[PDB]
Design a protein around this motif. Structure first.
Motif, PDB file in Angstrom:
ATOM      1  N   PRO A 113       0.755  -1.222  -0.163  1.00 37.66           N
ATOM      2  CA  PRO A 113      -0.034  -0.037   0.155  1.00 37.66           C
ATOM      3  C   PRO A 113       0.825   1.289  -0.093  1.00 37.66           C
ATOM      4  O   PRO A 113       0.194   2.371  -0.120  1.00 37.66           O
ATOM      5  CB  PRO A 113      -0.928  -0.143   1.192  1.00 37.66           C
ATOM      6  CG  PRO A 113       0.088  -0.943   2.144  1.00 37.66           C
ATOM      7  CD  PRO A 113       0.944  -1.916   1.178  1.00 37.66           C
ATOM      8  N   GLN A 114       2.145   1.186   0.062  1.00 40.22           N
ATOM      9  CA  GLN A 114       3.114   2.114  -0.128  1.00 40.22           C
ATOM     10  C   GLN A 114       2.903   2.892  -1.589  1.00 40.22           C
ATOM     11  O   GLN A 114       3.753   3.763  -1.837  1.00 40.22           O
ATOM     12  CB  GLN A 114       4.234   2.066   0.355  1.00 40.22           C
ATOM     13  CG  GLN A 114       4.470   2.218   1.909  1.00 40.22           C
ATOM     14  CD  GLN A 114       4.094   3.178   2.465  1.00 40.22           C
ATOM     15  OE1 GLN A 114       2.831   3.531   2.535  1.00 40.22           O
ATOM     16  NE2 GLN A 114       5.016   4.199   2.838  1.00 40.22           N
ATOM     17  N   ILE A 115       2.446   1.826  -2.533  1.00 38.01           N
ATOM     18  CA  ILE A 115       2.463   2.023  -3.901  1.00 38.01           C
ATOM     19  C   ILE A 115       1.292   2.468  -4.368  1.00 38.01           C
ATOM     20  O   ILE A 115       0.195   1.528  -4.207  1.00 38.01           O
ATOM     21  CB  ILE A 115       2.940   0.895  -4.759  1.00 38.01           C
ATOM     22  CG1 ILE A 115       4.459   0.384  -4.148  1.00 38.01           C
ATOM     23  CG2 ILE A 115       3.037   1.190  -6.091  1.00 38.01           C
ATOM     24  CD1 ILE A 115       5.068  -0.772  -4.874  1.00 38.01           C
ATOM     25  N   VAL A 116       1.017   3.545  -4.751  1.00 34.68           N
ATOM     26  CA  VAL A 116      -0.220   3.903  -5.537  1.00 34.68           C
ATOM     27  C   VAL A 116      -0.264   4.532  -6.980  1.00 34.68           C
ATOM     28  O   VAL A 116       0.426   5.605  -7.353  1.00 34.68           O
ATOM     29  CB  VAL A 116      -1.120   4.840  -4.372  1.00 34.68           C
ATOM     30  CG1 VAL A 116      -0.118   5.663  -3.637  1.00 34.68           C
ATOM     31  CG2 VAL A 116      -1.761   6.015  -5.251  1.00 34.68           C
ATOM     32  N   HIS A 117      -1.021   3.843  -7.778  1.00 35.29           N
ATOM     33  CA  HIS A 117      -1.245   4.525  -9.090  1.00 35.29           C
ATOM     34  C   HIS A 117      -2.303   5.567  -9.269  1.00 35.29           C
ATOM     35  O   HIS A 117      -3.277   5.476  -8.473  1.00 35.29           O
ATOM     36  CB  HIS A 117      -1.695   3.123 -10.064  1.00 35.29           C
ATOM     37  CG  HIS A 117      -0.835   1.971  -9.927  1.00 35.29           C
ATOM     38  ND1 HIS A 117      -0.534   1.100 -10.918  1.00 35.29           N
ATOM     39  CD2 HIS A 117       0.104   1.516  -8.857  1.00 35.29           C
ATOM     40  CE1 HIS A 117       0.044   0.148 -10.561  1.00 35.29           C
ATOM     41  NE2 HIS A 117       0.650   0.392  -9.385  1.00 35.29           N
ATOM     42  N   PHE A 118      -2.180   6.493 -10.089  1.00 33.78           N
ATOM     43  CA  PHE A 118      -3.288   7.353 -10.397  1.00 33.78           C
ATOM     44  C   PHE A 118      -2.846   8.281 -11.766  1.00 33.78           C
ATOM     45  O   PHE A 118      -1.858   8.138 -12.135  1.00 33.78           O
ATOM     46  CB  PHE A 118      -3.287   8.264  -8.998  1.00 33.78           C
ATOM     47  CG  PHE A 118      -2.060   9.342  -9.050  1.00 33.78           C
ATOM     48  CD1 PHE A 118      -0.739   8.634  -8.400  1.00 33.78           C
ATOM     49  CD2 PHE A 118      -1.951  10.629  -9.508  1.00 33.78           C
ATOM     50  CE1 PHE A 118       0.413   9.383  -8.379  1.00 33.78           C
ATOM     51  CE2 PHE A 118      -0.766  11.319  -9.286  1.00 33.78           C
ATOM     52  CZ  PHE A 118       0.488  10.791  -8.865  1.00 33.78           C
ATOM     53  N   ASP A 119      -4.054   9.079 -12.069  1.00 32.65           N
ATOM     54  CA  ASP A 119      -3.830   9.873 -13.235  1.00 32.65           C
ATOM     55  C   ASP A 119      -3.448  11.252 -12.898  1.00 32.65           C
ATOM     56  O   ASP A 119      -4.212  11.685 -12.051  1.00 32.65           O
ATOM     57  CB  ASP A 119      -4.910   9.626 -14.002  1.00 32.65           C
ATOM     58  CG  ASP A 119      -5.188   8.528 -14.766  1.00 32.65           C
ATOM     59  OD1 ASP A 119      -4.324   7.565 -14.847  1.00 32.65           O
ATOM     60  OD2 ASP A 119      -6.217   8.265 -15.659  1.00 32.65           O
ATOM     61  N   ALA A 120      -2.616  11.849 -13.396  1.00 31.69           N
ATOM     62  CA  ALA A 120      -2.286  13.462 -13.335  1.00 31.69           C
ATOM     63  C   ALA A 120      -2.854  13.945 -14.468  1.00 31.69           C
ATOM     64  O   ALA A 120      -2.713  13.516 -15.524  1.00 31.69           O
ATOM     65  CB  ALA A 120      -0.848  13.791 -13.241  1.00 31.69           C
ATOM     66  N   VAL A 121      -3.562  14.920 -14.321  1.00 30.05           N
ATOM     67  CA  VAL A 121      -4.386  15.521 -15.286  1.00 30.05           C
ATOM     68  C   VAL A 121      -4.157  17.110 -15.349  1.00 30.05           C
ATOM     69  O   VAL A 121      -4.243  17.780 -14.282  1.00 30.05           O
ATOM     70  CB  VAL A 121      -5.985  15.401 -15.086  1.00 30.05           C
ATOM     71  CG1 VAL A 121      -6.536  16.331 -16.460  1.00 30.05           C
ATOM     72  CG2 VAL A 121      -6.360  14.028 -15.234  1.00 30.05           C
ATOM     73  N   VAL A 122      -3.412  17.678 -16.626  1.00 26.52           N
ATOM     74  CA  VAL A 122      -3.264  18.949 -16.624  1.00 26.52           C
ATOM     75  C   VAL A 122      -4.049  19.833 -17.681  1.00 26.52           C
ATOM     76  O   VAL A 122      -3.906  19.466 -18.858  1.00 26.52           O
ATOM     77  CB  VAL A 122      -1.567  18.978 -17.185  1.00 26.52           C
ATOM     78  CG1 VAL A 122      -0.972  20.630 -17.124  1.00 26.52           C
ATOM     79  CG2 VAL A 122      -0.577  18.394 -16.041  1.00 26.52           C
ATOM     80  N   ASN A 123      -4.692  20.606 -17.302  1.00 24.72           N
ATOM     81  CA  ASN A 123      -5.444  21.676 -18.106  1.00 24.72           C
ATOM     82  C   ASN A 123      -4.199  22.717 -18.863  1.00 24.72           C
ATOM     83  O   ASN A 123      -3.784  23.581 -18.177  1.00 24.72           O
ATOM     84  CB  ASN A 123      -6.524  22.374 -17.459  1.00 24.72           C
ATOM     85  CG  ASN A 123      -7.322  21.306 -17.035  1.00 24.72           C
ATOM     86  OD1 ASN A 123      -7.625  20.320 -17.799  1.00 24.72           O
ATOM     87  ND2 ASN A 123      -8.315  22.018 -16.230  1.00 24.72           N
ATOM     88  N   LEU A 124      -4.190  22.620 -20.218  1.00 27.92           N
ATOM     89  CA  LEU A 124      -3.104  23.251 -20.716  1.00 27.92           C
ATOM     90  C   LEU A 124      -3.345  24.897 -21.004  1.00 27.92           C
ATOM     91  O   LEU A 124      -4.392  25.189 -21.201  1.00 27.92           O
ATOM     92  CB  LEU A 124      -2.777  22.800 -22.276  1.00 27.92           C
ATOM     93  CG  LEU A 124      -2.139  21.181 -22.384  1.00 27.92           C
ATOM     94  CD1 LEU A 124      -2.014  20.705 -23.602  1.00 27.92           C
ATOM     95  CD2 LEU A 124      -0.654  21.164 -21.556  1.00 27.92           C
TER      96      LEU A 124
END
Length: 127
Positions: free
Chosen positions: A37-48
């Motif tokens: 659980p020290q490892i977590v996946h996720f999306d980063a989203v950047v509005n340009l």
């Protein structure tokens, strides 16, 4: 040329970073590793702040970028898995992706947009 204006209002479920106000964590994308659980996946989203013309059609441009990340809260290693460009904000709409995805793992140092994100992730799940 292009000269655009990322949303000031945050779309529900997106977490704005203090050190880049157009950089977000998609809450609904988060997965904490069942085994470690020290490892977590996720999306980063950047509005340009600029349209990226990465589409086959000339004046179609990307308004946002969605990046699959993997973060190890134990060592603050952040792995860049893939990148998709979208013609709307918040990482939706018409997608375009480079042909071969550049993957890369970065050891994060303090005081940078990415470290910010790591601190939020690990603060929430690192304890």
């Amino acid at each position: 040329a292009v000269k655009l204006a990322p949303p000031t209002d945050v779309r529900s479920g997106y977490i704005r970073l203090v050190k880049n106000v157009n950089y977000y964590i998609d809450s609904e994308s988060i997965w904490v590793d069942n085994q470690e659980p020290q490892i977590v996946h996720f999306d980063a989203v950047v509005n340009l702040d600029k349209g990226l013309y990465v589409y086959p059609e000339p004046k179609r441009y990307a308004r946002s970028v969605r990046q699959y990340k993997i973060l190890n809260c134990a060592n603050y290693h952040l792995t860049q898995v893939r990148t998709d460009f979208y013609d709307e904000f918040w990482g939706q709409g018409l997608r375009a992706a480079p042909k071969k995805q550049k993957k890369h793992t970065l050891s994060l140092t303090p005081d940078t947009t990415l470290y910010n994100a790591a601190q939020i992730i690990c603060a929430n799940y690192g304890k």
